[PDB]
């Protein structure tokens, strides 16, 4: 077992040898390739020689396990998100469908505000984001790390087809305090990366609250989380 496992992580590394690297983070590298004839993308949560391989072991596993159930939960709910093809729990790799020809919402918003020159043009996109996160939260699924770079825009761009990605920190909870804190981190994501887009966050919020049937208590806890800075 101890020898066979080294082999299974050794095929992994070989397989990713010849693949284009598309996303890199503190926890995960994302390679682009093909998997049994389908356009796929492989998300490796690599170990770092910096800490105890006992703690690092479970950290890769939890993120991968949690992303795997989160993408299943969204497929069975009409929440659009990548399909998962294979999950290697020996190497913490996650083989999923590539969202071909898509662009992040972050570059759809610093591309629309350099030509339109006003945020007045973004209220349809905000409307649809409110609809997407409302039906997500309505199945008590907390994303965990909502930013405008974990939402993709599938072609055709005109119809605003939002695909959510990166669910490693996601989790199930019906607590409005948890949905509230989930929207707060998306709010701070707008603030840091997209200047002067504050009017865009209620075309979102007003959309969310007319699209999710339990949103009233979540927006009371959002305004309580905005006042405190955290959940407590």
């Amino acid at each position: 077992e101890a020898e066979a496992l080294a082999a299974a992580r050794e095929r992994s590394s070989r397989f990713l040898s010849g693949l284009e690297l598309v996303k890199q983070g503190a926890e995960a590298r994302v390679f682009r390739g093909r998997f049994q004839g389908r356009a796929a993308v492989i998300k490796h949560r690599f170990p770092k020689g910096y800490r105890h391989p006992a703690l690092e072991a479970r950290l890769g596993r939890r993120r991968t396990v949690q992303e795997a159930r989160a993408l299943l939960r969204c497929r069975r709910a009409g929440i659009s998100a990548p399909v998962v093809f294979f999950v290697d729990y020996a190497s913490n790799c996650l083989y999923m469908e590539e969202i071909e020809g898509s662009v992040t919402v972050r570059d759809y918003i610093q591309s629309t505000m350099e030509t339109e020159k006003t945020p007045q043009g973004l209220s349809n996109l905000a409307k649809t984001i409110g609809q997407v996160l409302a039906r997500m939260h309505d199945e008590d699924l907390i994303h965990g790390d909502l930013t405008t770079s974990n939402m993709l825009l599938k072609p055709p761009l005109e119809q605003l087809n939002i695909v959510l990605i990166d669910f490693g920190l996601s989790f199930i909870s019906a607590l409005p305090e948890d949905k509230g804190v989930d929207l707060y981190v998306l709010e701070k994501a707008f603030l840091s990366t997209h200047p002067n887009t504050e009017t865009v966050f209620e075309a979102f919020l007003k959309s969310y609250s007319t699209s999710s049937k339990k949103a009233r208590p979540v927006l009371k806890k959002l305004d309580e989380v905005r006042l405190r800075g955290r959940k407590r």
């Binding site: 397989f15 049994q36 497929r75 069975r76 709910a77 399909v83 093809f85 294979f86």
Partner: protein, 176 residues
């Protein structure tokens, strides 16, 4: 009457070969031989296969757990069938996704690793049936029962194919 063979992308030492038969008369004898081990490969209900991708994903996860020694079933050829079920009921999985005594079309899947090959002309010789090419697989597959045995949704077909909804419960059932 043509095979369809594909190479496993993460285990390029292996290949997966698919053979499909119509008008089978000895499905009952064929099943006993799988439990008895005489016949090589996995005998799968083609009624519920929507694309070879369904077979390869199952094949891939089976070799992976085979090579780690942590398979949930016994044979590799039985782990392939099990990995097609959306549940973890091993016995329910192999009745509903295997072949049964009064079936008329069966699908044979087998993996060969490296130089070691299977006597494919002895394998066909055991089936009292008309081997057809896998291009004929859509006209055997029944969506009314793909939806029943996979419990596919209203919402699930609204955001993608039914192959995607299937693949995406095959590949996560080991984590509930």
């Amino acid at each position: 009457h043509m095979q369809l063979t594909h190479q496993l992308d993460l285990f390029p030492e292996c290949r997966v070969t698919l053979l499909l038969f119509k008008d089978v008369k000895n499905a009952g004898d064929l099943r006993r031989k799988a439990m008895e081990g005489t016949i090589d490969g996995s005998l799968i209900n083609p009624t519920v296969i929507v694309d070879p991708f369904q077979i390869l994903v199952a094949a891939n996860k089976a070799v992976h757990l085979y090579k780690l020694g942590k398979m949930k079933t016994r044979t590799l050829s039985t782990e392939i069938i099990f990995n097609l079920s959306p549940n973890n009921n091993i016995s329910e999985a192999l009745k509903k996704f295997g072949i049964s005594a009064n079936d008329t079309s069966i699908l044979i899947v087998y993996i060969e690793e490296g130089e070691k090959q299977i006597n494919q002309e002895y394998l066909i010789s055991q089936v009292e049936g008309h081997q057809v090419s896998l291009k004929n697989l859509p006209e055997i597959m029944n969506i009314t029962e793909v939806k029943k045995i996979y419990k596919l949704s209203s919402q699930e077909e609204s955001i993608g194919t039914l192959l995607d909804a299937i693949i995406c419960r095959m590949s996560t059932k080991d984590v509930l």
